[PDB]
Amino acid sequence: MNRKWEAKLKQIEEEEPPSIWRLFHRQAQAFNFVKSCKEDVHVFALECKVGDGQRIYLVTTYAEFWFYYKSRKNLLHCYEVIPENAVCKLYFDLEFNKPANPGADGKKMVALLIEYVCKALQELYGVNCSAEDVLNLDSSTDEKFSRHLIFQLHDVAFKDNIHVGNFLRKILQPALDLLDLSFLVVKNNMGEKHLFVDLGVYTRNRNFRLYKSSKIGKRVALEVTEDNKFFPIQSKDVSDEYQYFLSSLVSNVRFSDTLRILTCEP
DNA sequence: AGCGCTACCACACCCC
DNA sequence: GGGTGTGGTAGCG
Ligand SMILES: Nc1ncnc2c1ncn2[C@H]1C[C@H](O)[C@@H](COP(=O)(O)OP(=O)(O)OP(=O)(O)O)O1
Ligand SMILES: [Ca+2]
16 A cells, blocks of 8 residues: 555646557556556656656557557667566566676576576476576677566566565575675675675666667667577467567566466565 | 665664 | 664665
8 A cells, every 4th residue: 555655745846540649747657547448558667858768658559569669760768667566577676787797698697597597496386497588688899798688487487576576686696795696696786795686776667678679878779699499389370579579578477377476575 | 647665874872 | 881772764676
């Protein structure tokens, strides 16, 4: 109830074919529309013209969004809005300052990370998976090894992203102590000891840069790594790039009549 | 007309 | 000197 109260105060304080394309200034007004929609619609965040994080919000289906998005001539700097309390996938934001840590073997650190989380998923939930179920994206530059991992688990999902964070803090506590998970620590922008895993992305209504999208500032967009081992099922009725787009979406959990929802309280 | 939060610091408090 | 909650903005994500 504590969350539903903060929104109520912010509110008072503030022919053609079957298409759906609604832009909203307030994230709250967007989700309100989704409820009164009657169509499998979702919420996207577009970075406004301002160089800061000022964002506007779009509401449309995945298919209709990919239609006006695939060319990459329009709708640049888009983000997925991960709805609070909604079932989602296991994902990661991986990033360290390249020059600050030279000896870091990026492609080797991710494999060690995945094999750990995989083992963790088995010991704690009986879930079995391998890197073959891990969509691997890249947005790196000459100064930042940036990677996004989206797990594609078979009939499995988390209660929400808040529980994903709890899962990681639990299994990454041995590394957090280091103010064998030695390969996680990395020197930050100013010599400080941060964690190769960004644990600040597991919040309510988190934005997450979409596939083939770059921040309003730079121009490097997310793309599938070369060592990626997740390959969707080829379907003649939709393009392959659309498959990766659907997979990459954190909050687009495969409909399954045997879905195991995973929880984890802190 | 973004949104969410925590890391950080100040203070106040308590205890033999 | 240690140890434990409480505000409250400032800045990351
Ligand atoms: N000002 C911001 N406002 C709202 N959401 C943000 C903001 N900054 C970051 N986020 C969200 C969207 C981002 O996809 C998510 C992770 O932070 P961030 O690392 O900066 O983006 P990114 O991982 O997609 O690119 P990269 O890390 O390589 O710079 O947090
Ligand atoms: Ca990042």
